[PDB]
Design an enzyme around this catalytic site. Structure first.
Site, PDB file in Angstrom:
ATOM      1  N   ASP A 162      47.998  26.465  34.117  1.00 51.77           N
ATOM      2  CA  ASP A 162      48.490  27.694  33.469  1.00 51.77           C
ATOM      3  C   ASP A 162      49.099  27.404  32.098  1.00 51.77           C
ATOM      4  O   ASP A 162      50.005  26.573  31.986  1.00 51.77           O
ATOM      5  CB  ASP A 162      49.502  28.359  34.386  1.00 51.77           C
ATOM      6  CG  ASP A 162      48.923  28.999  35.635  1.00 51.77           C
ATOM      7  OD1 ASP A 162      47.703  28.787  35.920  1.00 51.77           O
ATOM      8  OD2 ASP A 162      49.683  29.824  36.250  1.00 51.77           O
TER       9      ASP A 162
ATOM     10  N   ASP B  15      47.100  34.318  31.507  1.00 52.80           N
ATOM     11  CA  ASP B  15      47.188  35.672  32.064  1.00 52.80           C
ATOM     12  C   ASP B  15      47.471  36.707  30.994  1.00 52.80           C
ATOM     13  O   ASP B  15      48.481  36.605  30.314  1.00 52.80           O
ATOM     14  CB  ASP B  15      48.328  35.721  33.060  1.00 52.80           C
ATOM     15  CG  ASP B  15      48.005  34.881  34.280  1.00 52.80           C
ATOM     16  OD1 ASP B  15      46.887  35.008  34.831  1.00 52.80           O
ATOM     17  OD2 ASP B  15      48.859  34.049  34.650  1.00 52.80           O
TER      18      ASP B  15
ATOM     19  N   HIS C  19      43.736  40.246  37.122  1.00 48.98           N
ATOM     20  CA  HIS C  19      44.133  39.915  38.490  1.00 48.98           C
ATOM     21  C   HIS C  19      45.658  39.929  38.672  1.00 48.98           C
ATOM     22  O   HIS C  19      46.065  39.583  39.779  1.00 48.98           O
ATOM     23  CB  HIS C  19      43.484  38.592  38.936  1.00 48.98           C
ATOM     24  CG  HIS C  19      43.809  37.414  38.093  1.00 48.98           C
ATOM     25  ND1 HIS C  19      43.031  37.007  37.011  1.00 48.98           N
ATOM     26  CD2 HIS C  19      44.859  36.549  38.152  1.00 48.98           C
ATOM     27  CE1 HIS C  19      43.556  35.937  36.464  1.00 48.98           C
ATOM     28  NE2 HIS C  19      44.710  35.646  37.123  1.00 48.98           N
TER      29      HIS C  19
ATOM     30  N   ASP D 169      41.401  32.188  39.444  1.00 49.27           N
ATOM     31  CA  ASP D 169      42.669  32.742  39.987  1.00 49.27           C
ATOM     32  C   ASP D 169      42.578  34.031  40.789  1.00 49.27           C
ATOM     33  O   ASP D 169      43.562  34.309  41.474  1.00 49.27           O
ATOM     34  CB  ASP D 169      43.753  32.846  38.928  1.00 49.27           C
ATOM     35  CG  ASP D 169      45.135  32.524  39.463  1.00 49.27           C
ATOM     36  OD1 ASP D 169      46.160  33.109  38.905  1.00 49.27           O
ATOM     37  OD2 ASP D 169      45.310  31.689  40.363  1.00 49.27           O
TER      38      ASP D 169
ATOM     39  N   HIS E 202      44.632  28.251  31.792  1.00 52.75           N
ATOM     40  CA  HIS E 202      44.590  29.564  32.468  1.00 52.75           C
ATOM     41  C   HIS E 202      45.625  30.493  31.791  1.00 52.75           C
ATOM     42  O   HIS E 202      46.850  30.178  31.838  1.00 52.75           O
ATOM     43  CB  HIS E 202      44.812  29.415  33.979  1.00 52.75           C
ATOM     44  CG  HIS E 202      44.732  30.738  34.671  1.00 52.75           C
ATOM     45  ND1 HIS E 202      43.564  31.459  34.717  1.00 52.75           N
ATOM     46  CD2 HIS E 202      45.673  31.453  35.314  1.00 52.75           C
ATOM     47  CE1 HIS E 202      43.810  32.576  35.357  1.00 52.75           C
ATOM     48  NE2 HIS E 202      45.090  32.655  35.710  1.00 52.75           N
TER      49      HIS E 202
HETATM   50  C1  LIG Z   1      47.516  32.430  39.007  1.00 54.65           C
HETATM   51  C2  LIG Z   1      48.217  32.446  40.385  1.00 54.65           C
HETATM   52  N1  LIG Z   1      49.003  31.166  40.647  1.00 54.65           N
HETATM   53  C3  LIG Z   1      49.247  33.547  40.608  1.00 54.65           C
HETATM   54  C4  LIG Z   1      49.475  33.871  42.089  1.00 54.65           C
HETATM   55  O1  LIG Z   1      49.958  32.700  42.747  1.00 54.65           O
HETATM   56  C5  LIG Z   1      48.730  34.775  39.816  1.00 54.65           C
HETATM   57  O2  LIG Z   1      49.356  35.984  40.173  1.00 54.65           O
HETATM   58  C6  LIG Z   1      48.748  34.527  38.369  1.00 54.65           C
HETATM   59  O3  LIG Z   1      47.640  35.244  37.766  1.00 54.65           O
HETATM   60  C7  LIG Z   1      48.512  33.069  37.997  1.00 54.65           C
HETATM   61  O4  LIG Z   1      47.858  32.841  36.772  1.00 54.65           O
HETATM   62 ZN   LIG Z   2      46.196  34.205  36.565  1.00 52.24          ZN
END
Ligand SMILES: *[C@@H]1[C@@H](N)[C@H](CO)[C@@H](O)[C@H](O)[C@@H]1O
Ligand SMILES: [Zn+2]
EC number: 3.2.1.114
Length: 1014
Positions: free
Chosen positions: A311, A62, A441, A174, A60
Site C-alpha cells: 500500500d 486507494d 473497493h 484488493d 496499491h
Molecule cells: C486493501 C485492504 N487491506 C483493505 C481491507 O483490509 C481495503 O479496505 C483497502 O482498500 C486496502 O487498500
Molecule cells: Zn485498496
C-alpha cells in the site's frame, strides 16, 4: 446463438461443485499457515530448463479509504508518481505497474510540458505499464456491471487519448472476493489476461494442490468457451512483500528493503532485512531462490511472477533506491551462478503473461477450464467478508440512482450535438467520474472512514445535479417546436421529480405543483423512458389541490387517482410510530405511456370539485384508541378500526393478505388459484461479546437472528383503483407494500437509530420446497446457483444481492428484486432474507480503524414476484446458472431504470410538443440499450454515437413473445455513413458492418456499436 439453457458446460473446475466436495478444514500448515510445506525436486531445473523470474514493482493506491481522494493525492500518490517518473527515467531496467487512472490523470494534468513528454517516453518504452487501466480497481460484489464498464471506459478512454495505450492485462489485488462479471467485460474489451488475489484461503489451498491457480475462466453458461479469459490467482494470504516471494513470510519479509534503516517499518517475524553485500549475497540468494522455487511448484510453467509492493509504496526516492539496488545485487549474483539455473529480472505484468503463453505454446502446460465465482471470501478462520455487502446502505442505494441518472443524461443529450457554451460534455464527464470513483473497493463497499463517505456522497450529489441539468435542457430541446426553441443554457426549463430518491420520509424535497383556477390552472409534466420498448407505468406528482384531472397534450382524458401525502413520526409519550396526513399537498397518480427511448407530455388541470376521470383512495388507520386525522381538502374521511387481517387486490392482479401487524402473509395469483403462504418478518443479528467482532467488512453474528418485538404497530391501508398500499410503523422500519396490478413493490424506510451492535434483516418464509438451493445475481448481469452449506458458518452462506435473488421448486418460484445492493441468503428451505442496515461499535481489524456508527435513514425498494414455473423450460439440475422470467426481469427494470419525471418550471410552455420517439423501434423484451453516448464534440466533422446492447436470457414459459420490431442502433440517428462493432469501451473497431446495420446479439451477450454520421 449458443443455447444457454439445455447444454451444461464441461469444465475442469466448477466452483459450486468444488464447494460441495471441499472440507474447508483450517489446519496449521506450518510457515505457510493456510497451505502445506512445499517440496520441489532440485533436478527439475538445469541449464536447458531454467526458472525465469519476473519481479514486478507495484504500489496499491486507494482512491479514498482512510483519507479522501484529494488528501491521498496531495500526501502520497503525487509523490509516488513523481518518484516513479524520475527513477524509471534514470534506471532503464527498473519497471513499475500502475492500476488507478483516476490518480494518474490527476497527476499528468498537473505536469509541465517537458515532464509530460518524459512520462510518455517511459510508457512508450514499456517501463511504466498500466494494468487494467480503469478509473479505479472496483468492488466486484456490489457493483453493477454497467458501472464496472463505465469506470473501465473512463480510464481506458483517458489512456488512449493521452498515453496511446490500451491495457490487455488486468490487476485486481484488493477487492474482497472476485466475480466472473470481470472476465466477461474484460474479454469483450480486448483483454487477454487477468490477475486476482482475495479468494478464500481454502480455495487457494485446493487449487494450489492441483496447480489450478492459473485457469481459463469462462462464464457459467458458456458451453463453447469463447468467453474464456486466462486468469492468474495469487496463492498466499496477501499481496504484500512477505506474502509474495514464496510460502514463508519470515523469509520474504527480509527482502522488503524498506523494513530496515530509517523508514520506521519492521518485520513482525522479528528477522530484519539486511543490505545485500559481497559477504552475504550467496547466503541471501540461497534463501530467496528456495522461496521462488517453492512458489513455482504451485504453477505449471517455468515463468514465475513475483510482485514487489504494498500500500502506497514507492513514495520516497530512497525507497526506490533501497529496493532497486538490493534486488539488482541479488539478480547479478543469481544470474551469474549456474547452480541456481535461474534468470531473474524486473518485469511487468504483461511480460509475465506473454512469457507464460510462450511456455504454453511450446507444450510446457495445458491450463484447466473454470467457471463460477469467488464469493464469499474469508482471509482466516471463520472471518467471512459478508458485512460489506450491506455496510453504508444509503450510499449503496445512491449508486443505483446515480447509475440511472448518468444513463438517462447521456441518452437524452446524445440525440443532438450541443454548442460548447451549453457545457453538456463538462457536466457528463463530472458525473461519469464521480460515479466511476464510487465503484472503488472502499466506495460502494461502505468500508471508508466517515469523512471519506461524506466526500463520496458530496461528489455523487454534484453528479446527480449535473445529470438533472443535462436532462432538463435535453427535454426542452426535444419537445419544443424549432420555430420557438431559443435556449438559455443556464436556465431551469424543468425540475426533476423523483419519488424514490432520497424518498420523502428521508428528505421532504419533492416540488408541489401549485395550481389555482384564477392564477395557474394547469401544469405540463414530461416522462422519459430510457428503455428501448414502449412502457406504460404509473407516475405520481405532488399537487396543491385534490381536484386535479390529467390529459395528454392533445386533451384526451387520462384516468387518475388522488391519494393523501402521509409521513410517519415517533410519539415520545406512547413510543408509537404513527402516520400524519398532509392538509396542503396530495398525490396525483396516472398511467404514462412513453415511447421506446422517448418522451411523453401530460397536463395537470385544477377544477373546483371531484373531476370526471379522477378517483380518490380510501384510508383506513388500524390502531386502538384512535385520535382524529384531518386531510384538508381531501374529499374522503379517514376510517378507523382496531388491528385486523386485511386483503387487497388492484385490477385483475394478485390478491395479497396481510397480518394484523401489516406484514404480508399470502399471495393469490388468480381468482381460482390457491392462497400461497408468503410471510414477511423482521429479525435482528447481534455481535459476539467474546471473540471476533463484526465491523464494516466482517459479518460475525452471535448465532441465528432473533425475533424483534413489534408491539401493536400502527397500520395504514390506502385503497385505490390504480394504487393501494399497506404501511406499518415498526421499530427502525416503516414497511410498505404497494400494489399497482402486478408484482407488489416493497419500500422500507430504515432508521437503525442508536441501536449499537445490531443488523436488521428482512426475511420471507414460504412452503417453496427449495431445500439448500437458491439463486443470487452477480453485478446485475447473471444469476448464479448457490447451495447453502451447513458445514460453513452462517456468515459464509451470505452472498451479495446486487439486484435480485430467488428460490424455487418444481412448481413455484419467489423472486425478490432490489433497487440497491445488500447482503442476503436462503438459510432454510422456503426462505429468502436480505439485510437492511448494520450498526457496529467495534473495528474488525482490517485497517479501517472504526466501526460503523454513521448510519442515516435510507429508503430501500424491492419488487416481489411469485410465479408458477411448472410450464417453464428450466436448465437441467447440473446447470450452475438460473434465469429470470419476463415478469421478474421487467420488475428489476422498474426498480433500476424507472420513468424519469419532469415538471415544466415556468407558467407557459410556448411550442410544447406531445411526444418524442413515437417511431423508435420497440425491441424484444430481453434486449436493452444499456448505453447511448455521443462520442464527439460539436466541432467534429464526423459525429460518432456509441451504443452498448445487452441481451439477457429469460426463461421460456409457453407465452409466445408478441409483435416486436428489429432494433438497429446504427439507424437511430440520421445520415449514418458507417457502423462498426467495437470493444465495449468503444476504443477498438472490430468489424465494419454490412449495410450499416448493427445486428441484434445472442442471449447473455453484450456488444458495442459506433455509428458515424456525415
Ligand atoms: C486493501 C485492504 N487491506 C483493505 C481491507 O483490509 C481495503 O479496505 C483497502 O482498500 C486496502 O487498500
Ligand atoms: Zn485498496
Amino acid at each position: 446463438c449458443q443455447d444457454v439453457v439445455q447444454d451444461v458446460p464441461n469444465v475442469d473446475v466448477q466452483m459450486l461443485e468444488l464447494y460441495d466436495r471441499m472440507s474447508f478444514k483450517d489446519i496449521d500448515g506450518g510457515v505457510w499457515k493456510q497451505g502445506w510445506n512445499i517440496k520441489y525436486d532440485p533436478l527439475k531445473y538445469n541449464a536447458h530448463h531454467k526458472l525465469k523470474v519476473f519481479v514486478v514493482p507495484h504500489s496499491h493506491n486507494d482512491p479514498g479509504w482512510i483519507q479522501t481522494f484529494e488528501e491521498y493525492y496531495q500526501h502520497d500518490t503525487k509523490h509516488i508518481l513523481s518518484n516513479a517518473l524520475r527513477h524509471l527515467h534514470d534506471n532503464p531496467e527498473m519497471k513499475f505497474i500502475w492500476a488507478e487512472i483516476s490518480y494518474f490523470a490527476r497527476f499528468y494534468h498537473d505536469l509541465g510540458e517537458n515532464k509530460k513528454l518524459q512520462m510518455k517516453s517511459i510508457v512508450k518504452n514499456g517501463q511504466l505499464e498500466f494494468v487494467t487501466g480503469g478509473w479505479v480497481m472496483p468492488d466486484e460484489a456490489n457493483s453493477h456491471w454497467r458501472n464496472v464498464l463505465l469506470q473501465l471506459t473512463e480510464g481506458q478512454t483517458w489512456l488512449k487519448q493521452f498515453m496511446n495505450v490500451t491495457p490487455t492485462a488486468s490487476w485486481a489485488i484488493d477487492p474482497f472476493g472476485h466475480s466472473p462479471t470481470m472476465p466477461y467485460i474484460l474479454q469483450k474489451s480486448g483483454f487477454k489476461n487477468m490477475l486476482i488475489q482475495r479468494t478464500h484461503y481454502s480455495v487457494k489451498k485446493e487449487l494450489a494442490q492441483q496447480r489450478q491457480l492459473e485457469f481459463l475462466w469462462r462464464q457459467i453458461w458458456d458451453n463453447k468457451g469463447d468467453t474464456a479469459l486466462f486468469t492468474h490467482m495469487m496463492p498466499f494470504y496477501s499481496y504484500d512483500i512477505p506474502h509474495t516471494c514464496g510460502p514463508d513470510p519470515k523469509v520474504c519479509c527480509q527482502f522488503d528493503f524498506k523494513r530496515m534503516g530509517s523508514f520506521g517499518l519492521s518485520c513482525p517475524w522479528k528477522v530484519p532485512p539486511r543490505t545485500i553485500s559481497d559477504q552475504n549475497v550467496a547466503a541471501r540468494s540461497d534463501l530467496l531462490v528456495d522461496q521462488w522455487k517453492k512458489k513455482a511448484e504451485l504453477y505449471r510453467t517455468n515463468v514465475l511472477l513475483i510482485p514487489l509492493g504494498d500500500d502506497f509504496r514507492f513514495k520516497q526516492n530512497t525507497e526506490w533506491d533501497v529496493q532497486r539496488v538490493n534486488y539488482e545485487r541479488l539478480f547479478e549474483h543469481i544470474n551469474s551462478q549456474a547452480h541456481f539455473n535461474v534468470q531473474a529480472q524486473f518485469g511487468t505484468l504483461q511480460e509475465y503473461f506473454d512469457a507464460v503463453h510462450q511456455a504454453e505454446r511450446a507444450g510446457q502446460a495445458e491450463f484447466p477450464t473454470l467457471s463460477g465465482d469467488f464469493f464469499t471470501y474469508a482471509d482466516r478462520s471463520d472471518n467471512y467478508w459478508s458485512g460489506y455487502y450491506t455496510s453504508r446502505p444509503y450510499h449503496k442505494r445512491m449508486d443505483r440512482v446515480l447509475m440511472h441518472y448518468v444513463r438517462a443524461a447521456e441518452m437524452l443529450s446524445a440525440w443532438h450535438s450541443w454548442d460548447g457554451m451549453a457545457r453538456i460534455e463538462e457536466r457528463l464527464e463530472q458525473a461519469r467520474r464521480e460515479l466511476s470513483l464510487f465503484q472503488h473497493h472502499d466506495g460502494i463497499t461502505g468500508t471508508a472512514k466517515t469523512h471519506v463517505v461524506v466526500d463520496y456522497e458530496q461528489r455523487m450529489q454534484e453528479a446527480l445535479k449535473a445529470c438533472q441539468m443535462v436532462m432538463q435542457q435535453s427535454v426542452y430541446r426535444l419537445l419544443t417546436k424549432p420555430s420557438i426553441y431559443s435556449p438559455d443554457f443556464s436556465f431551469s426549463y424543468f425540475t426533476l421529480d423523483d419519488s424514490r430518491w432520497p424518498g420523502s420520509g428521508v428528505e421532504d424535497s419533492r416540488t408541489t405543483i401549485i395550481l389555482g383556477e384564477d392564477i395557474l390552472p394547469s401544469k405540463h409534466v414530461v416522462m422519459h423512458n430510457t428503455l428501448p420498448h414502449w412502457r406504460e407505468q404509473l407516475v405520481d406528482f405532488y399537487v396543491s389541490s385534490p381536484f386535479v384531472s390529467v390529459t395528454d397534450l392533445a386533451n384526451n382524458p387520462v384516468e387518475a387517482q388522488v391519494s393523501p401525502v402521509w409521513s410517519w413520526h415517533h410519539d415520545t409519550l406512547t413510543k408509537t410510530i404513527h402516520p400524519q396526513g398532509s392538509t396542503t399537498k396530495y398525490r396525483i397518480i396516472f398511467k404514462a405511456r412513453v415511447p421506446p427511448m422517448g418522451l411523453a407530455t401530460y397536463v395537470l388541470t385544477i377544477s373546483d370539485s371531484k373531476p370526471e376521470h379522477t378517483s380518490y383512495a380510501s384510508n383506513l388507520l388500524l390502531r386502538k384508541n384512535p385520535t382524529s386525522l384531518p386531510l384538508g381538502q381531501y374529499p374522503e374521511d379517514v376510517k378507523f378500526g382496531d388491528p385486523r387481517e386485511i386483503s387487497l387486490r388492484v385490477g385483475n392482479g394478485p390478491t395479497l393478505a396481510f397480518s394484523e401487524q401489516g406484514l404480508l402473509k399470502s399471495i393469490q395469483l388468480t381468482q381460482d388459484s390457491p392462497h400461497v403462504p408468503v410471510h414477511f418478518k423482521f429479525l435482528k443479528y447481534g455481535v459476539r461479546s467474546h471473540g471476533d467482532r463484526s465491523g464494516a467488512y466482517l459479518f460475525l453474528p452471535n448465532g441465528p437472528a432473533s425475533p424483534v418485538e413489534l408491539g401493536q404497530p400502527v397500520v395504514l391501508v390506502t385503497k385505490g383503483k390504480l394504487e393501494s398500499s399497506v404501511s406499518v410503523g415498526l421499530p427502525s422500519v416503516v414497511h410498505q407494500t404497494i400494489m399497482r396490478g402486478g408484482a407488489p413493490e416493497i419500500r422500507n424506510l430504515v432508521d437503525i437509530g442508536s441501536l449499537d451492535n445490531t443488523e436488521i434483516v428482512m426475511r420471507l418464509e414460504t412452503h417453496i420446497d427449495s431445500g439448500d438451493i437458491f439463486y443470487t445475481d452477480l453485478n446485475g448481469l447473471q444469476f448464479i446457483k448457490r447451495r447453502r452449506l451447513d458445514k460453513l458458518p452462517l456468515q459464509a452462506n451470505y452472498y451479495p444481492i446486487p439486484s435480485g435473488m430467488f428460490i424455487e421448486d418444481a412448481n413455484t418460484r419467489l423472486t425478490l428484486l432490489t433497487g440497491q445492493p445488500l447482503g442476503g441468503s436462503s438459510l432454510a428451505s422456503g426462505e429468502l432474507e436480505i439485510m437492511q442496515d448494520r450498526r457496529l461499535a467495534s473495528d474488525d481489524e482490517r485497517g479501517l480503524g472504526q466501526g460503523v456508527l454513521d448510519n442515516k435513514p435510507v429508503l430501500h425498494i424491492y419488487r416481489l414476484v411469485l410465479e408458477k414455473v411448472n410450464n417453464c423450460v428450466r436448465p437441467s439440475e447440473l446447470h450452475p446458472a438460473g434465469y429470470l422470467t419476463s415478469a421478474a426481469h421487467k420488475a428489476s427494470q422498474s426498480l433500476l431504470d424507472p420513468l424519469d419525471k419532469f415538471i415544466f418550471a415556468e407558467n407557459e410552455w410556448i411550442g410544447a410538443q406531445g411526444q418524442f420517439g413515437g417511431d423508435h423501434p420497440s425491441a424484444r423484451e430481453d434486449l436493452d440499450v444499456s448505453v447511448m453516448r455521443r462520442l464527439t464534440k460539436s466541432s467534429a466533422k464526423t459525429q460518432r454515437v456509441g451504443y452498448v446492447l445487452h441481451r439477457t436470457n429469460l426463461m421460456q414459459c409457453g407465452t409466445p413473445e408478441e409483435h416486436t420490431q428489429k432494433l438497429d442502433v446504427c439507424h437511430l440517428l440520421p445520415n449514418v455513413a458507417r457502423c462498426e462493432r467495437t470493444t465495449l469501451t468503444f476504443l477498438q473497431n472490430l468489424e465494419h458492418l454490412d449495410g450499416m446495420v448493427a445486428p441484434e446479439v445472442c442471449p447473455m451477450e453484450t456488444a458495442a456499436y459506433v455509428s458515424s454520421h456525415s
